[PDB]
Design a protein around this ligand. Sequence first.
Ligand SMILES: *[C@@H]1O[C@H](CO)[C@@H](O)[C@H](O)[C@H]1NC(C)=O
Lengths: 99, 595
Amino acid sequence: GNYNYLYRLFRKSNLKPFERDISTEIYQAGSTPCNGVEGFNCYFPLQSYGFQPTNGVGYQPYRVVVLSFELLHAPATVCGPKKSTNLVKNKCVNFNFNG
Amino acid sequence: STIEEQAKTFLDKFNHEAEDLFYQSSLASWNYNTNITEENVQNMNNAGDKWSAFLKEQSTLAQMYPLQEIQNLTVKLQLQALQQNGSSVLSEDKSKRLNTILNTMSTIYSTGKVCNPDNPQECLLLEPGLNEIMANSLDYNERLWAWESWRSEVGKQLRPLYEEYVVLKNEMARANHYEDYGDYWRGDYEVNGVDGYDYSRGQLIEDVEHTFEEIKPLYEHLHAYVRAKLMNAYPSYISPIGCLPAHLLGDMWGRFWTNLYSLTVPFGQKPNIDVTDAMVDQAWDAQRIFKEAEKFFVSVGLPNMTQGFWENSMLTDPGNVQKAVCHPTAWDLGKGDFRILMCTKVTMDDFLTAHHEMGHIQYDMAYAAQPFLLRNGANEGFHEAVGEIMSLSAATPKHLKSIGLLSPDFQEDNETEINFLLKQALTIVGTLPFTYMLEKWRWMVFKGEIPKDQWMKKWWEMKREIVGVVEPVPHDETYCDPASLFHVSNDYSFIRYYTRTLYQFQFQEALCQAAKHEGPLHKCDISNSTEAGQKLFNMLRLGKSEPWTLALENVVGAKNMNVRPLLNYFEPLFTWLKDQNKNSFVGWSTDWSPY
Ligand SMILES: *[C@@H]1O[C@H](CO)[C@@H](O)[C@H](O)[C@H]1NC(C)=O
């Protein structure tokens, strides 16, 4: 079992889209203010899952990526691959040379 | 700030660690069983000790959490199953004394000794001794001598040990706010918190008594049949009025009566349904057996196995290169890893055992979707019944003929069906009255209704009155007779077998009714019906999140435990016994004494 893959489990409020949390303070479960140590109302919200090679579907590690498509008042930087056909020397044809 | 949030946080923090430790312990036990060395046993012991320490720490931490303010039934059940104090309710000295008593009883009982007189040798262990003696014995004198040596030599030395054991059990029960240890055993079947589906503890005893009274006629007919067969086979060895002896039942504990099948069969001249010769004479092995079992399970509607199940399982005896246990053990891990450890041969009994293990693995994969505190059946009998029903449905001749184990030209004779019904009766009902009597005696001795100097007296009077077994020679009160079993000396229940026997018949009847198949139950097919498989899987995925009564009602329809499937199955055999016992006496009398 691997224990290097940490993850956050408990939070006090929901997160916003496209937000990354940096602070890793302990979670407060009760009304007593946590003084930085664990207790009956203070537990560490960060844990780590276990990935084993003998685990079936649902426990295997899956690398998922998220592609965000946004556009605003700025020139385009990423487009699609434009194709190019074979030209003809002497023939009445329609041409499209870069726009 | 409330208690529910803290409880959910504790559960989420504990479930992952519990699953990890359970996976580690299972891997250590697998490496120990598959590789007997000096370090694997130490690693397994260390893993078990770490798991026990972590579980005790988590239980002590969770004990501080209340149980009344939480309205969630699942969380309440998980906390009730986790906050169990166990043996910690007593003092440290009493706890260590109980542990030492358990250890010495386990070391003494698991070895055994014959030690025949006037012979300084041939004092083998329990397995190569009394087991092989009573296995295929056909003499009265040697069986009586073995029974006397087993009940006398190993009956008087364990009387103070058993007394201290039951005293410590009663003390632990009274210290945990329970009236008796039997109350703590029966509390596992009680379900509360659900309106219209709760089951009281006092109703279970009444239901068991009613089922036993309804089975009484079948057991009396079977006893009369066995007595008639013994009189016809052993003249002047059994009286037609008195009860049957204890050493002529073919078993030391009277659990399995299959040893007298070849002697009490009325149609022994007919061939059996064994398909071992049909498979050993062709290219067949355990791999093809497991493949056909998986095909049957997927035809019924059960999910498929993972990729790790067909690559880590050692389904072949490696031989003298390394020591490997061949005992069938349902290896459950709950984290996608599943495997079966059994040296399956090309016989039929091994085929049924492999089907049973595959059903166990299917149930494990079914309830694996729940946390570690819920990866188990509703009661302690469903986990075995789920595999037993599949093993029984796979033993049908039509299924073996469709697969290829049975020849298509094999005729269907009623004599084979009668013999199969008689064998099933002798192997199932032959121990149900003994199980009920033992359970009632243990309940009464844990509650305190039996005098101290009348334990064996009441035991023998119930074995003579309720059961139809009588001892050939009476013993004194110094010989502890009920302590001759394994479950009574290792803190294991006995009513679980009866509950499993009822639940397997209930499930078989439900699957036969859902399949829209007509005819008797012994030939009713379960495969080729995805609706019944889906209905069964809908109940297998429940686990402990729902009461067992609602789980049974969702598949069978009955509110409580039912016994009518057993009667519907044994009706042909019951009528056959009534027709054969027309000119013979039925029942037994306690006035006769074979002394
Ligand atoms: C099992 O395999 C069969 C064969 O492809 C498939 O149809 C079925 O959906 C599978 N079931 C599960 C639970 O994986």
